[PDB]
């Protein structure tokens, strides 16, 4: 017999299996399509999530009820120090897919990437890339042969970059490596750009700018083993029912004589890799501005670091991206920021944001002062001050 009361299904079946990710660094599965007449550009960046705050913007959006009005919005801050280029990989199009055929590295790598290549760094003799460093001796010619091979073959060019983890307040000491696709023109000019940029840094101002919508790729916060009520969003059975009530009552019928793949069991919740699109960039801030937490309606000398530091993170002290809204993953996790995969035809992707105020009160507690001078001026002189 039919159900007699229709209801939509609990949960999305295209996000299966709800299992743990294979790494902390979520992988980029698509890049913007190459246009061989534009200049050479990088298409993604990688940084660290450091907390949230609140802003006030003056809104200009014709046709809405908040046209020429002030609006309070939540934003997320990503700590983005420069990235440093260390290699290049070429890919050939095979009738089974793309196949990497050649990798070239730089002559002088660093201790952070060497730490990435080791598991027990405190005992090792640090022998990595020691024979590869001899390939650059006077002629060498293996480097030039490999770069000539990438120029001749290899219809897709990716650059190997690593982070500057020692410029963050983290304890990890051990940098992250990633491949970033180059989408300029002229395969030869792509690998010439890469070979010129070996052992040098790229800032986020050379990849992104304000009023642009980007995508964020990260692994979400983990929660362990979870029951069906919070893992899937089902109803609760009434009260004091036999063998519990945080359960699904009927998991199958007579026929088929199996449990089906869509009938909501218990298991792992969180620690999944997710891609979220269309997040607008509200501020690209520099690490030496000394008033990068100020606006043209605030007139106070302060940075974006809140009063007492970001909770579980620390100070900023670097360049940063300030995007609108929520981002997957928790604080101090590694995030990949990707450029837009298509040309957006909305006016939201075409507006120009004007910040009016940035909140810098304490998030460790109920903060109600923005600067310590404001706290000292409100409270007055104390017993230890005199």
Partner 1 sequence: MRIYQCHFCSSPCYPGHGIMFVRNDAKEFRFCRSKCHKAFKQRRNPRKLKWTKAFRKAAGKELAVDSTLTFAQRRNVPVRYNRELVATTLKAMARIEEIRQKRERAFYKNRMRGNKEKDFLRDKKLVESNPELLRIREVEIARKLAKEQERAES
Partner 2 sequence: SGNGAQGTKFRISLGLPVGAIMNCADNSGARNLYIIAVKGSGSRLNRLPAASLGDMVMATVKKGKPELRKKVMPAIVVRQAKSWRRRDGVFLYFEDNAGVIANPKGEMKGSAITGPVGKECADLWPRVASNSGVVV
Partner 3 sequence: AKSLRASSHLNAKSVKRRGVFQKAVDAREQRISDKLKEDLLKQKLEDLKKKEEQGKISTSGWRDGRHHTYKKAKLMKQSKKKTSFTRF
Binding footprint of partner 3 on the chain (CB under 8 A): 38-41, 102, 135, 142, 144-146, 148-149, 152, 196-197, 200-203, 205-209, 212, 343-345, 349-350
Which CB atom, from 296 or from 343, has the smaller least distance to partner 3? 343
Which CB atom, from 218 or from 281, has the smaller least distance to partner 3? 281
Give CA–CA dist 294/303, Å, rounded: 7
Contacting Mg ion (CB under 5 A), which of 1, 2, 63, 384?
A: 2
Contacting partner 2 (CB under 8 A), which of 16, 22, 30, 71?
A: 71
* Residue 235 binding target from partner 2, Mg ion, partner 3, none, CB below 5 to 8 Å by type: partner 2
**Positions in 37-56 near partner 2 (CB under 8 A):** 54, 56
Binding of RNA at residue 63 (CB under 7 A)?
A: yes
**Positions in 337-356 near partner 1 (CB under 8 A):** 356
Tokens 């609760």 label which residue? 236
| H or E stretch covering 215 | strand 213-219
DSSP labels, 38-96: SPP-B-EEEEEEEEEEEEEEEE--TTSTTTTEEEEEEEEEEE---EEEEEEEEEEEETT
Q: Which stretch binds partner 1 (CB under 8 A): 160-168, 195-203, 242-250, 367-375?
A: 367-375
* Residue 349 binding target from partner 3, partner 1, Mg ion, none, CB below 5 to 8 Å by type: partner 3
Q: What is the nearest approach in angstroms of partner 1 to the Cβ of residue 368?
A: 5
Binding of partner 1 at residue 378 (CB under 8 A)?
A: yes
Give CA–CA dist 168/59, Å, rounded: 34
The widest CA-to-CA distance across the chain, in whole angstroms, is: 84
Tell me the helix, strand and coil percentages in the chain, rounded to 5: 15, 25, 60
DSSP labels, 267-336: EEES--EEEEEEEEEEEEE-TT-S-TT--TTT-----SS-TT-BTTTB---S-EEEEES--SS-TT-EEE
Q: What is the nearest approach in angstroms of partner 3 to the Cβ of residue 341?
A: 12
Q: What is the nearest approach in angstroms of partner 2 to the Cβ of residue 232?
A: 16
Which CB atom, from 27 or from 356, has the smaller least distance to RNA? 27
Computed on alpha carbons and rounded to an integer, the radius of gyration of the chain in Å comes to: 26
**Which of 257, 306, 301, 314 is closest to 49 using CA atoms?**
314
Binding of partner 1 at residue 72 (CB under 8 A)?
A: yes
* Residue 369 binding target from partner 3, partner 1, RNA, none, CB below 5 to 8 Å by type: partner 1
**Positions in 346-385 near Mg ion (CB under 5 A):** 363
Contacting partner 2 (CB under 8 A), which of 99, 235, 246, 368?
A: 235
- Under 8 Å between Cβ of 264 and 312: no
**Positions in 241-300 near partner 1 (CB under 8 A):** 297, 299
**Which of 113, 76, 110 is closest to 313 using CA atoms?**
76
Contact partners, residue 146, CB within 8 Å, separation at least 6:
102, 103, 104
Binding of RNA at residue 16 (CB under 7 A)?
A: yes
Look up residue 363 and give its two tokens: 């998030």
Residues interacting with partner 1, by CB under 8 A? 54, 56, 70, 72, 297, 299, 356-357, 359, 361, 366, 368-370, 374, 377-378, 380-381, 386
Residues interacting with partner 2, by CB under 8 A? 5-7, 54, 56, 65-66, 69-72, 235
């Amino acid at each position: 017999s039919h159900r007699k009361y229709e209801a939509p299904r609990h949960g999305h079946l295209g996000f299966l299996p709800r299992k743990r990710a294979a790494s902390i660094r979520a992988r980029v599965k698509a890049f913007p399509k190459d246009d061989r007449s534009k200049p050479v550009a990088l298409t993604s960046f990688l940084g660290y999530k450091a907390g949230m705050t609140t802003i006030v913007r003056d809104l200009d959006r014709p046709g809405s009820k908040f046209h020429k009005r002030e609006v309070v919005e939540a934003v997320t801050v990503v700590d983005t120090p420069p990235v440093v280029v260390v290699g290049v990989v070429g890919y050939v199009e095979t009738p089974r897919g793309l196949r990497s055929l050649t990798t070239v590295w730089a002559e002088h790598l660093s201790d952070e990437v060497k730490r990435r290549f080791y598991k027990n760094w405190y005992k090792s003799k640090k022998k990595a890339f020691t024979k590869y460093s001899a390939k650059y001796a006077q002629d060498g010619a293996g480097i030039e042969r490999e770069l000539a091979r990438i120029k001749k073959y290899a219809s897709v060019v990716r650059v190997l970059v690593h982070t500057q983890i020692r410029k963050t307040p983290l304890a990890q000491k051990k940098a992250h490596l990633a491949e970033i696709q180059l989408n300029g023109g002229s395969i030869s000019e792509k690998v010439d750009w890469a070979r010129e940029h070996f052992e040098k840094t790229v800032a986020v101002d050379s990849v992104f700018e304000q009023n642009e919508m980007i995508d964020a790729i990260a692994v979400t916060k983990g929660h362990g083993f979870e029951g069906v009520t919070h893992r899937w969003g089902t109803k609760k059975l009434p009260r004091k029912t036999h063998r519990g009530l945080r359960k699904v009552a009927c998991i199958g019928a007579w026929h088929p004589a199996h449990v089906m793949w869509s009938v909501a069991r218990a298991g792992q919740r969180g620690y999944h890799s997710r891609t979220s699109i269309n997040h607008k960039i509200y501020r690209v801030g520099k690490g030496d501005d000394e008033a990068n937490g100020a606006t043209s309606f605030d007139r106070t000398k302060k940075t974006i670091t809140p009063m007492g530091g970001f909770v579980h993170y620390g100070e900023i002290k670097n360049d940063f991206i300030m995007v609108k809204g929520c981002i997957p993953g928790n604080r101090k996790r590694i995030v990949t920021l990707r450029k837009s995969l298509y040309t957006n035809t909305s006016r939201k992707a075409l507006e120009e944001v004007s910040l009016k105020w940035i909140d810098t009160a304490s998030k460790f507690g109920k903060g109600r002062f923005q600067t310590p001078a404001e706290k000292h001026a409100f409270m007055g002189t104390l017993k230890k001050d005199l």
